[PDB]
Amino acid sequence: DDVNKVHLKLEGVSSPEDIKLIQSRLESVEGVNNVECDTAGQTIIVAYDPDVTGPRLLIQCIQDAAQPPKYFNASLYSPPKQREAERHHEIRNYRNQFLWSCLFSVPVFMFSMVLPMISPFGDWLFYKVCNNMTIGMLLRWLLCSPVQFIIGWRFYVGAYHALKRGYSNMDVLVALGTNAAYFYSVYIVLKALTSESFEGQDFFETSAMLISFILLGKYLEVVAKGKTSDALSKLTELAPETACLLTLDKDGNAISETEISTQLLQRNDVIKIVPGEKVPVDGVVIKGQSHVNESMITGEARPIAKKPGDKVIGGTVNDNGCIIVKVTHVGSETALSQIVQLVEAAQLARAPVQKLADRISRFFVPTVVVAAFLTWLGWFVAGQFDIYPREWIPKAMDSFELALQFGISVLVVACPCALGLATPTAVMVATGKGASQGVLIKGGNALEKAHKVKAIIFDKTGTLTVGKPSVVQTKVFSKIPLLELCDLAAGAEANSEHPLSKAIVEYTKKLREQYGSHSDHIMESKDFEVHPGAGVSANVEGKLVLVGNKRLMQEFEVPISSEVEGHMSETEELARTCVLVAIDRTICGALSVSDPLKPEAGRAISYLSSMGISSIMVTGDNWATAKSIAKEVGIGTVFAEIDPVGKAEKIKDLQMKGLTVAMVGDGINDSPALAAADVGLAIGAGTDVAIEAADIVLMRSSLEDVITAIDLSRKTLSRIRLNYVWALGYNVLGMPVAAGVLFPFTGIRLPPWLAGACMAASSVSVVCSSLLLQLYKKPLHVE
């Protein structure tokens, strides 16, 4: 905080004197509205203006107000990546809890499994202290009381929540199992202590080991969560905490290059980014020149060439030069901060498969308890009436002991808690591993829907275009006075600028012959005429290079005589499609328009066909151009002269046939069709505006990562289904054998000390199976 109701007690502050030492200079200096007065009420809540007269002024008032016992040094209460501190504390908590659990658990298992086999140590443990109860059970009970009563508290606290609401979950079972085992051991110890005739056996190893491994599983879950969050965080930061403040008004009078935090340099404050000073913030950069590997103003190495002054500011590390920034709004409201929030909300949200897990668990836990109860009565009543051989009973217990022993065994051999510790971690790890590639999922629902896909809707614009206008795309075949017509020659096409008219202005920039400027007249807008398809023509020159469309040609004089249809078929075949022109108010001369494609399209289409899904693309141009593009690509059904509305009806038609179809592209105007489509997956990431109407959002611009997204989704669904197959296979065999349908015919059953081990063994393997997703790699390592 420390923005509106600012409150700080920094180094040296121990009493109200230092609090007032901050106060007196902080609040008194302008930028406050003085919301009431608490008259030295410690955290006095008054208004403040952290926008203009904010961080820099407030913080430096804190320092200059101070006379040092420690000299207050700007210890603003702000999140140190509060996620980092938070999962640090959480990992610390669970790690410590598990580590103190093992401290008791490991002893007990030893003392009653391994140690008795060796002497005289077991002989010490056999020393009677009363009747037949011995030292062994005494110390075992003492050591295993903490494990449940103190450390295992969640197992009870969480269970009560579910039970009071009328439902249940994993906890419920685990708690019942361990509790029943513990009290059965207490019961068996009492019999030993009261009467020396009895010599029964105990069970505490189960109650220790099971709890220990379950806690280990929860620890692994939260470690996976921490890894995913940090993988997000490293990508979301991409900025140094401090920027160099060369203070000057707008341009000129450069005072000095300081170095302070990137919230203290807004509102006409200036960064003079030197080489290597990574671009932290936004806000118009009126001066400077730096080609750095990004899209803001350029000029050092990688040629994009924006002259000083342009409205985009963010970027990566530098090169040989500098810029002089004029921040209006720092890079803090940037999308990344709330991609963090949005993906957390998606993580907070869940998928149908997650909803599937709860429903099965809803009508499973009741069954296990009932079956465990039933198998008790079976052995008991048959035992009481003695309807089966006595010799099956092992020595040192009776039928009643066998009945309860089987009762416990079923209750501790159930679900290895896959349904609750495998799905909710696989879903999570998938998102993090995707985020490592820039691509981000929008929760599990996105995973499911993307996994169900067999069709993709592409589009040429901004998805498969580069653009290079020249004689192969934009100029004459006849003679042209004032060639090559850009600087002061061709104003005949600078009338009505749009995404294509500007290209008509820029091929002239590209082709300017060799002289600098022949400089004749540029009569822009003289006879200004606009018509759809080509709305630029006035009067100027370029052999009168006016340009026009189906209504400007025959208007001026242009008869569209046979040679233009010849140069039309010719150009369209070579994809260099012509655009109608009015050279010298005549049919002489013939413009063109063409487009290079991103050089991985063939790879992508071929490999998508390899997975076996349909590729579809639409265009707004004529049918022939789209057909030529199809010939180049090798795509299926093709559409042309299509608006985003038409894209919407085509999407609806594909879906109603029973086809889940995706679409590519981020041109925000796709929003109707983008929402209409089954999923999102917008290429060339913009901001959360894409997220508004899309679910999948791809970060980079390469078409390659589209393959990666669907591949990862397919892999995740396969892994989850395989884990469910395991959780059915183990569970369908564990229940009978433990309950006993093999003992009556072979005489083998699982004692609870070992029966619980299988439950423990599966739980680790299932989670460990899920965690292996992190070793995913690209299906196309640069094709």
Side-chain angles (χ1 to χ4, degrees), residues 276-489:
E277 195 292 337
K278 183 174 174 66
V279 194
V281 298
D282 290 331
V284 177
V285 182
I286 193 66
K287 195 52 71 203
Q289 186 178 2
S290 284
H291 279 314
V292 298
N293 175 66
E294 56 84 20
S295 197
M296 65 82 71
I297 80 164
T298 56
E300 65 183 1
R302 281 82 66 193
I304 309 144
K306 277 79 71 176
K307 183 266 289 181
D310 178 80
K311 182 69 176 177
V312 63
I313 299 91
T316 313
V317 298
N318 298 115
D319 208 305
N320 59 6
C322 65
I323 62 170
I324 317 165
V325 177
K326 194 194 52 53
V327 180
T328 60
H329 61 86
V330 299
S332 66
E333 69 274 15
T334 60
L336 278 297
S337 55
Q338 59 289 19
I339 293 91
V340 176
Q341 301 157 49
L342 274 153
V343 307
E344 285 322 301
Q347 284 160 47
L348 202 172
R350 54 211 201 81
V353 71
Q354 187 63 80
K355 304 178 191 67
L356 188 152
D358 175 72
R359 303 313 304 155
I360 281 296
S361 180
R362 193 71 192 286
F363 279 70
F364 173 84
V365 163
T367 300
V368 164
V369 175
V370 164
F373 153 81
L374 188 153
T375 192
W376 164 65
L377 173 150
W379 294 98
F380 179 75
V381 170
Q384 183 144 80
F385 296 165
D386 181 14
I387 317 290
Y388 61 99
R390 282 83 65 194
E391 51 283 30
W392 288 342
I393 307 304
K395 63 84 181 173
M397 59 294 286
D398 76 340
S399 52
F400 181 80
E401 294 294 328
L402 275 296
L404 298 161
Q405 193 162 53
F406 289 165
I408 287 284
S409 302
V410 181
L411 183 62
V412 195
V413 78
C415 55
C417 295
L419 295 174
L421 313 169
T423 291
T425 181
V427 167
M428 165 184 290
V429 183
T431 305
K433 182 66 181 294
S436 192
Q437 294 320 296
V439 164
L440 73 164
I441 312 309
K442 187 44 70 171
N445 207 348
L447 292 169
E448 267 180 68
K449 300 163 158 173
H451 156 67
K452 308 306 295 312
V453 66
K454 64 202 91 73
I456 293 177
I457 300 302
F458 287 107
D459 64 280
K460 73 212 181 283
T461 43
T463 294
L464 305 155
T465 78
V466 188
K468 67 181 178 67
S470 73
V471 64
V472 68
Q473 148 170 9
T474 43
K475 67 93 174 179
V476 72
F477 67 92
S478 296
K479 67 182 290 294
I480 57 171
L482 260 184
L483 73 85
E484 292 180 353
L485 59 95
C486 201
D487 190 359
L488 282 72

Side-chain angles (χ1 to χ4, degrees), residues 503-579:
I504 316 165
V505 176
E506 309 276 310
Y507 68 94
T508 63
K509 266 283 161 283
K510 204 182 320 302
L511 283 72
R512 190 71 179 91
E513 186 178 1
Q514 302 76 50
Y515 70 74
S517 178
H518 186 254
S519 303
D520 189 359
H521 61 311
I522 45 164
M523 294 184 287
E524 281 77 0
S525 296
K526 280 74 176 175
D527 301 80
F528 178 92
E529 312 159 32
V530 175
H531 291 80
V536 305
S537 66
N539 180 46
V540 189
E541 208 165 318
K543 197 33 151 63
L544 199 61
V545 75
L546 295 175
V547 178
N549 204 238
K550 280 74 176 175
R551 177 68 273 172
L552 284 170
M553 293 299 109
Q554 69 275 17
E555 174 270 312
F556 286 131
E557 189 275 331
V558 182
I560 61 171
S561 81
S562 79
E563 64 87 19
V564 68
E565 289 83 3
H567 204 265
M568 183 277 288
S569 46
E570 167 207 338
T571 49
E572 171 73 278
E573 292 179 353
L574 282 72
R576 40 198 281 282
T577 71
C578 56
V579 54

